[PDB]
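TEACHING EXERCISE
Course module: macromolecular assemblies
Task: Read the component lines below, then compare them to the predicted structure of the full complex.
Student: A.B.
Group: 4
Components provided:
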Amino acid sequence: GSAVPFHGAHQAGIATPVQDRLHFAAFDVTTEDRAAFVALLKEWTAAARRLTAGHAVGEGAYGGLPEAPPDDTGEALGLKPSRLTLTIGFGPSLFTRFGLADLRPEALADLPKFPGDNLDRARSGGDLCVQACADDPQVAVHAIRNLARIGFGKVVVRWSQLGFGKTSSTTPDKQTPRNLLGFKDGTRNIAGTEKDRLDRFVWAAEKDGTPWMTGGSYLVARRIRMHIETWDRASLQEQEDVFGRDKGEGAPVGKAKERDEPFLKAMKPDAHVRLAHPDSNGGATLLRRGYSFTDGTDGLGRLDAGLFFLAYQRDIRTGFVPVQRNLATDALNEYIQHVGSAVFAVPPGVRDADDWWGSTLF
Amino acid sequence: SAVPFHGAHQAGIATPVQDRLHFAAFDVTTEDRAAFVALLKEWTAAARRLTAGHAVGEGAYGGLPEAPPDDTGEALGLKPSRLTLTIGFGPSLFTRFGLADLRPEALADLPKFPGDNLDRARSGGDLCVQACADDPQVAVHAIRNLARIGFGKVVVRWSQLGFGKTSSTTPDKQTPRNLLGFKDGTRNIAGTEKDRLDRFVWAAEKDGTPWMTGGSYLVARRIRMHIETWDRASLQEQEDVFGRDKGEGAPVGKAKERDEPFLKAMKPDAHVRLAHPDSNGGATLLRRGYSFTDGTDGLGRLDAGLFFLAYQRDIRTGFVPVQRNLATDALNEYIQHVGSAVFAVPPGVRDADDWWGSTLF
Ligand code: HEM
Ligand code: HEM
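Instructor-supplied answer key:
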């Protein structure tokens, strides 16, 4: 229930241990005034400092003037910080505004079309995003709600996604969570303690070509539906062949323990692990940080289920893009469909109490 | 960490309220009574496993490679998490299987209420399973696997996820707050109050339906909050709507949350004043609802509210009179009922040989 420090060279919520809940919101900007947008970013940073410490925004949730609406909507009163992190990102469409055209990073690449894509344009894209993660879903909603409230008239929520449970791990010393297909998900990721691998694969560097992005990262979000009726009638052997690890232990095929290293030549040539492994992609390595979702029924008598896939990387062109291209023949494709997509440049961290979100860009 | 599955009553009504909810309504697609009874027994066997934290059937792995696993496996490694599974039967079930003359009179159809805006697709249902647990993945796994076991005899009609408190960080003493920011649950029937449960919650033999003795009647309402409107109201407007202050949740004029309210100090259309048993001839409800937030709608608004659940001994003397009295509730400006269902919740599964619905079938 403790707090995660908000200030740093990097934004929290990436290398941070993965919290239980997610509320992800994408915003479009509705103001033409650069000064007004900068004032928004400063007000948002002040609110974030309160929220991530477990305090109410502004002058608080009650005890103010009777005739005024309260500064804070109040539904997190008496709750702990709950490891809340707030991570902001900037979408490519943002750079068509405020004269930012020449500051768009080369590494913030539009994704190509992939075979099987069925992207809903209403739940894709966005000028910016806020990723709220916490162990308490009410804490995460309270944070998104109050940020959107503060931004009234300057931003509007384009789409959002709640994740009821994590399907990722940055802490390999703790139990790996399972996704809704029943497999452990997160075994071979990047750990928050692997500072060298984060430098190599996650954090943007000044020499990469965009100095305002130094210390930041790039985010790919993909909303993926799971065909669970189809999956649930597949044999156990079929399911394990699809991934290349057994279902119970999560060990690489042939081996006894989850964390034993995969021997890829023993997996089917279209096994998901074989195709996604860095060794199959010229070393390309991602930080996966996704969550499971379910949004009711599908209207056809079935549960709706999916995975909200989030990947952080130093350069979209050398992280997600090569790996996802290599998944064109993935055996998993029979059981999933990508139905939403968005990319964002995640700026560097808020260095101290005088700093603010996006200050290196604006 | 676990709640016993067997008893005179079904768990999940008077037992401690867990952090998360997955509520599912099912429709029945078989006409064959024997097929439906077979499913009730199979579901009961699965519920026994699930509430003890075990996988269904012969498990999630280790079986024949050429067969699908009995359990879909996403709760492997998790704890029981105080999972309870509570089954209920909808009025529409009684048009099947020759049961028409066995519908309880206390299982009444609800009247239309001023301001109803019910989505038919998220209303009704032949039966329900309320899955409550501290870990939402444990709850989802239970619904997912019951639906799979039932495939061919039942389909899922609608499903709702909900959250209350997070107990690993919030004292069990503390009243949870709803998404309007007010403490919610202060004056409620507690599961410790065995006499009030007998008077207001559990169906009795003399009530007129012997197979329902020890059961209860459930009203479910999906209530949307108009969040962005509410958040633009003044603090005084918000407190006037309920009759309690927002910080402490004390009734107007008193100092502490648990002070008994003085109804005449509240505005005449204040929510607490209209809902109170003294304004409804003594009618008293067990509320066991959960908050929800499903995302944002096409206009950018928060799709959020209260998945209201009330248990009572008779729908005609519980939910209906109180909801009728809310016709003029000041809160009506900020909420809209968009989904509705009622269920007869049978008595408990008495031992390892008993099964869900045995007193009815
Ligand atoms: C519903 C969609 C997906 C499911 C169910 C899924 C499932 C899994 C599972 C069970 C593992 C093995 C355990 C682990 O090391 O994490 C894994 C590994 C991995 N997956 Fe996926 N995955 C999905 C989508 C994706 C996508 C879209 C990508 C990238 C575009 C991806 C990239 C990876 C990578 C890089 C690994 C680690 C491979 C290694 O280094 O051993 N996954 N996935
Ligand atoms: C979004 C919808 C609703 C909200 C936000 C809400 C909120 C509240 C709040 C804040 C209280 C005061 C604290 C407490 O004793 O729990 C309360 C009391 C109560 N509410 Fe509501 N309520 C809602 C809908 C309903 C409905 C539909 C009913 C019944 C049909 C109902 C019946 C009651 C009752 C019986 C009390 C106890 C009053 C007393 O005896 O003092 N509520 N509610």
